[PDB]
């Protein structure tokens, strides 16, 4: 997901989202993707995972 966002902000002409992680209340990881004063979070059992659903998140926000 990450790189369809990253692809999507190429082709756009926009600046690369960011990332942060924090703790997951069930011991997982919950990440937050920040991207033109959009927020979306990703919730998995790691940070790969939690980042690229935060990625998927936010990129249909933006993109549809």
Known sequence: AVSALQEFCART???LPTYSF???EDGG???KV???EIEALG???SKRDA???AASNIL???QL
């Open 13 to 15: 002409q926009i600046n």
């Open 22 to 24: 924090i703790p997951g």
């Open 29 to 31: 990881y919950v990440c």
């Open 34 to 36: 920040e991207l033109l």
């Open 43 to 45: 919730n998995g059992r």
């Open 51 to 53: 980042k690229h659903l």
């Open 60 to 62: 249909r926000k933006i």
